[PDB]
Amino acid sequence: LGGPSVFLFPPKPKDTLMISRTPEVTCVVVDVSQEDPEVQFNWYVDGVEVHNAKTKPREEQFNSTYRVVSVLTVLHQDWLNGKEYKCKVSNKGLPSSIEKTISKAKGQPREPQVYTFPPSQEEMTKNQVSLRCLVKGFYPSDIAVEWESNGQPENNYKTTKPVLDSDGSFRLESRLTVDKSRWQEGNVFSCSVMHEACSWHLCKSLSLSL
Ligand SMILES: [Zn+2]
Ligand SMILES: [Zn+2]
Ligand SMILES: [Zn+2]
Question: Which residues form the domain of 65?
Answer without folding.
Answer: 1-103
